[PDB]
Amino acid sequence: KQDLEKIESDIINDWTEADDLDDALDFLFMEKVSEFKIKFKDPLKVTEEEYRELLGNYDSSNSVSSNGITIDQYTYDEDDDIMYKLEFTYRKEDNKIYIYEVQGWREK
């Protein structure tokens, strides 16, 4: 019954859908990408804090939400007068965020 040595020796875990998206964002945020759009047949489930981790340090935001949906917009002030706009379309119920759509683009 000393297989609990196996349990503490165990490496976990750790990946989650958010991590997987976050990793994509990493790519999609590069200076060379001018704009991307990702639509989800089945929405990408995510926790409130997982969602806050995906946003990381925007300068400003605005969101609007009629019916079950929230179009949430985020701004990242960049160099040479360029704003970066990230936008998440999502239903939330509750404490768990169901992203139906992510969009990115830049503006002067």
UniProtKB/Swiss-Prot annotation:
InterPro entries: SIFV_Orf14. Gene3D superfamilies: 3.30.160.300. This is Uncharacterized protein 14. It comes from Sulfolobus islandicus filamentous virus (isolate Iceland/Hveragerdi) (SIFV).
